[PDB]
Amino acid sequence: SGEEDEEILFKERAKLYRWDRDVSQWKERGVGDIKILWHTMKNYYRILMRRDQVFKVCANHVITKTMELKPLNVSNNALVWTASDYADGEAKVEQLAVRFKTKEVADCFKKTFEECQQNLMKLQ
Numbered sequence: 001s002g003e004e005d006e007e008i009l010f011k012e013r014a015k016l017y018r019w020d021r022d023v024s025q026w027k028e029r030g031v032g033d034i035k036i037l038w039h040t041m042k043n044y045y046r047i048l049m050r051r052d053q054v055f056k057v058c059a060n061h062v063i064t065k066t067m068e069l070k071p072l073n074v075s076n077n078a079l080v081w082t083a084s085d086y087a088d089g090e091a092k093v094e095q096l097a098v099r100f101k102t103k104e105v106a107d108c109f110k111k112t113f114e115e116c117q118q119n120l121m122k123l124q
Contacts, residue, residue, distance in 0.1 A: 003048065006037035010112045012105050016049060016058055019095035026097055029087075030058030034098060036112050043123070045116040047083070059096065060086040065120040069113050076103040079110060 014034040017026035034049040045063040050056065061083045072078040078099040084091045100106040 003035075003037060005041065006039050006046070008035055009038050009045075009116070010034075010036040010109060012109065013101055014049070015099045017097040017099070019097070021095075029096075030056070032058070034059065034109075036063075036109075036116065038116070045120070057087045059083075061091075063113070063116050063120070065117055065124075067117070069110055072097055072099075075099075077101075077106050079106060 011033050013032070015031050016029040016034070018029045019025075020027045030049065030051040032050050032052040034047070037046045037048055038044075039046070047059055047061055047063065048057070049059040051058050067081050067083060069079050069081045072080045078097055080095070080097045082093065082095050085094045085096070098109075100109060
């Protein structure tokens with residue numbers, strides 16, 4: 001509902017993890033559709049993801065030109081990046097990992113994500 005002014009560039013099922021910098025492991029953060037959104041008039045891009053049943057936000061942040069989306073080492077399903085994220089009600093720098101059903105979807109997510117970033121530079 002709070003996405004009225006944004007076109008959906010990507011929307012697929014995913015599992016999202018956050019790096020716990022103590023127990024040194026990935027802790028599950030949510031399961032549901034993850035989106036890449038584009039605010040038409042204000043010209044910015046955003047990641048947004050709500051959990052399946054409860055509909056709590058598990059990721060929400062603007063895409064920046066310095067973010068680096070790489071694979072989780074040799075994986076074909078999982079991608080990894082650092083974002084200053086708002087899910088907990090304030091901006092916190094988190095290390096995120098998102099894993100898709102197929103290799104194909106993951107590739108598409110990467111490609112779209114990178115497309116958005118390029119547009120960021122085309123206007124700088």
